[PDB]
Design a protein around this nucleic acid. Structure first.
Ligand SMILES: [Mg+2]
Ligand SMILES: [Mg+2]
Ligand SMILES: [Mg+2]
Ligand SMILES: [Mg+2]
Ligand SMILES: [Zn+2]
Lengths: 131, 136, 94, 38, 140, 141
RNA sequence: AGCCAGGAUGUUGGCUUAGAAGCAGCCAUCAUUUAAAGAAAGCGUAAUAGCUCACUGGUCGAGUCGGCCUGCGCGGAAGA
């Protein structure tokens, strides 16, 4: 029911959590299991939290309208099924790790765990300091 | 079959069926079956439509028959010449004019009432339409 | 608050009313109050699409006739017997 | 088929067609829903 | 007691009675026993158990649905699911008035490549209009 | 290889292992025999459902073996054992539909938080609570 | 409109509990697990399987979807 104002509000509400936390996620719709994917996504939500944006509104123009306030590189259309795993607890949280692991298992593909980050240029994960 | 319990006179003149109807409004129930056409409805037809509505809609709900036969129609026997008195009464008919509400119903959803009245109208000779109450 | 546009009728009678209803207008009247009744003609399709609502009959209506609005309320409505068409609407002032 | 004088879509898979002027009902679900004349 | 057929599970208990303690004729007491049994049945209004036997059928694993559907169109119940290496074994409970010529129907629906055996399991209630027909054919 | 691969709901809930004779012979699709009837459920079907409702997933595998993560303690078992009256739907509104109690819900939340969890352990706890209340009637709790 | 996918692991339902089957009868029961769970569609509905009521996300670039009133038409419409 993505009406004009309803879709505008939903895009803003989805961008709010993503901008408040770490990078979001994506789950294309190619292949899922009856319980292997259902329980896997259930555990992904349990670890990530109750505010992950599993819904998909990643149309090109919709993103250019709502998401494109800052970091316009994410405004590019994610032409596939989208499910975002919010990650409040630090950068690239356990939800991000779960998406990275499920990129090659328990789902069709995680879109390489593309996400969105404020730097938008550090291809490496949040491991800048070796220590 | 509907019929007057008692009648002042056995036979009645044929008369005409001119004019529009006076029972034009949905009064008792919520929905109603208005008449778009004109003609006679015998007690058999009225009763057949009543079976139709009652069986179509659930047993729940209230049905009013806004029309009563109260008109003795006669037929001469077969193989009988003309004259020799008027024919004896055979059936009773309610004269209908455009706008007369025949049946009303209440306690039922819109679509189920529409279906029941469609099934009822399939049993009647005249054109009929579906109407609902209106404020005032 | 429903607003209707009406024009004062020129001819009144059976034939004139039939001509109005064929011409897609229809007659109506505004009586009551301290002045004499006013016979008007109304746009039938607009009046129907407006009066389908139940609030048309409890709310106060404003009929703009020859430039001046009249605050009125629908007292009675003559409906066509077997068609969705209104034949006449009575308006008591205020 | 059915040549009834009143032909209706008897299920979701029926389609109304107007071949040769005649109004037919053609069904890709099961063949009993084939009708001939409007 | 009903329609010339026997009974199971009844248990009798002579609790009271009267007599004279000189000559309690057994033959004369048999009339009392018969009348007591008749009044007892009349007050019981008990019903009939048809003969339902257990049928065990081995069939290929392609006509399983067809054979159990036939057994279900028949007023019969099923018991136990099994899958043989070379087929499937179904078990069912069916009346005796019914399944007359069941072998030919089984062969028809399984290409004559299925077998069945019978062992006459304990009975069950069955609504049949013939139970009263057989007894009311002779009036009262 | 494939988990179960044949979901035939003609298997007894808890109770005796492989209760096919009561379950019915209208479920011959599954390859359940004397080998897979009590391969694991015989020794792992006492600490989960002891006289309490718990449907069991066979999890038969095409790798010439039967092995998988079996279902955790059932909600139909926990809420039934902690309610006393296991009644429910069928007579949901006209009579008792079994007791749905915060005690049973909390027991399920605390015990079944290992495997059978959805969007959270507490989420599956609320699942069991809904399964208890949705039967048609709930006790004061 | 057309082309890429999803419907359970509390749930043989707590069940007319010998289930009547994650879509017989059934009560009604989001069941958080959501691009979704209705405890109900053709399938096998007595059962999985693979298409899948529904519904959505993606694909593609301008009309789209249906109801009401009315004008003229079509079928219904076979005889010596
Ligand atoms: Mg005149
Ligand atoms: Mg015609
Ligand atoms: Mg013609
Ligand atoms: Mg002909
Ligand atoms: Zn069809």
């Amino acid at each position: 029911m993505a009406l004009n104002l309803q879709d505008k509000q939903a895009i803003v509400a989805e961008v709010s959590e993503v901008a408040k936390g770490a990078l979001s996620a994506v789950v294309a719709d190619s292949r899922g299991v009856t319980v292997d994917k259902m329980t896997e996504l259930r555990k992904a939500g349990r670890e990530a939290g109750v505010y992950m944006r599993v819904v998909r509104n990643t149309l090109l123009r919709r993103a250019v309208e709502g998401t494109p306030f800052e970091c316009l590189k994410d405004a590019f259309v994610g032409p596939t099924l989208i499910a975002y795993s919010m990650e409040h607890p630090g950068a690239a949280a356990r939800l991000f790790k779960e998406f990275a692991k499920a990129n090659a298992k328990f789902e069709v593909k995680a879109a390489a765990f593309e996400g969105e980050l404020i730097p938008a240029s550090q291809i490496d994960r949040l491991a800048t300091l070796p220590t | 079959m509907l019929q007057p319990k008692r009648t002042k006179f056995r036979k009645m003149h044929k008369g005409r069926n001119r004019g529009l109807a006076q029972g034009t409004d949905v009064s008792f129930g919520s929905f109603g079956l208005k008449a778009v056409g004109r003609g006679r409805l015998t007690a058999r037809q009225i009763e057949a439509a009543r079976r139709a509505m009652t069986r179509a809609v659930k047993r729940q709900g209230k049905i009013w028959i806004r029309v009563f036969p109260d008109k003795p129609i006669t037929e001469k026997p077969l193989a009988v010449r003309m004259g020799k008195g008027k024919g004896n009464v055979e059936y009773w008919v309610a004269l209908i004019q455009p706008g007369k509400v025949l049946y009303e119903m209440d306690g039922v959803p819109e679509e189920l009432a529409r279906e029941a009245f469609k099934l009822a109208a399939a049993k009647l000779p005249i054109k009929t339409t579906f109407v609902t109450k209106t404020v005032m | 608050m429903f607003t209707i546009n009406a024009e004062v009728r020129k001819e009144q009678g059976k034939g004139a009313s039939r001509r109005l209803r064929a011409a897609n207008k229809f007659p109506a009247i505004i009586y009551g109050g301290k002045e004499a009744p006013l016979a008007i003609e109304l746009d039938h399709d607009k009046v129907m699409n407006m009066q389908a609502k139940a609030e048309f009959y409890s709310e106060v209506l404003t009929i703009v006739v020859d430039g001046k609005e009249i605050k009125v309320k629908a007292q009675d409505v003559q409906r066509h017997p077997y068609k969705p068409k209104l034949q006449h609407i009575d308006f008591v002032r205020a | 088929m059915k040549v009834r004088a009143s032909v209706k879509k008897l299920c979701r898979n029926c389609k109304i067609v107007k071949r040769d002027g005649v109004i037919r009902v053609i069904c890709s679900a099961e063949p009993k829903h084939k009708q001939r004349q409007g | 007691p009903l329609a010339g057929y026997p009974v199971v599970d009844m248990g009798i208990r002579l609790h009271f009675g009267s007599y004279h303690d000189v000559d309690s004729s057994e033959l004369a007491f048999k009339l009392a026993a018969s009348i007591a049994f008749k009044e007892g049945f009349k007050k019981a209004k008990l019903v009939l158990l048809e003969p339902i036997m257990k049928v065990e059928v081995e069939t290929p694993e392609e006509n399983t649905g067809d054979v159990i559907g036939d057994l279900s169109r028949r007023r019969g119940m099923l018991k136990g699911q099994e899958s043989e290496v070379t087929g499937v074994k179904i078990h069912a409970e069916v009346p005796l008035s019914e399944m007359f010529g069941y072998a030919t129907q089984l062969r028809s629906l399984t290409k004559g490549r299925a077998s069945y055996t019978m062992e006459f399991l304990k009975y069950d209630e069955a609504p049949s209009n013939v139970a009263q027909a057989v007894i009311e054919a002779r009036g009262k | 290889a494939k988990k179960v691969q044949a979901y035939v709901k003609l298997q007894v809930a808890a109770g005796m292992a492989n209760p096919s004779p009561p379950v019915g012979p209208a479920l011959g699709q599954q390859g359940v025999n004397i080998m897979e009837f009590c391969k694991a459920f015989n020794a792992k079907t006492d600490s989960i459902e002891k006289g309490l409702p718990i449907p069991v997933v066979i999890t038969v595998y095409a790798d010439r073996s039967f092995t998988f993560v079996t279902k955790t303690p059932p909600a139909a078992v926990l809420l039934k054992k902690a309610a006393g009256i296991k009644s429910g739907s069928g007579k949901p509104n006209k009579d008792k539909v079994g007791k749905i109690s915060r005690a049973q819900l909390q027991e399920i939340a605390q015990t079944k938080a290992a495997d059978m969890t959805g969007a959270d352990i507490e989420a599956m706890t609320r699942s069991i609570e809904g399964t208890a209340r949705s039967m048609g009637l709930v006790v004061e709790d």
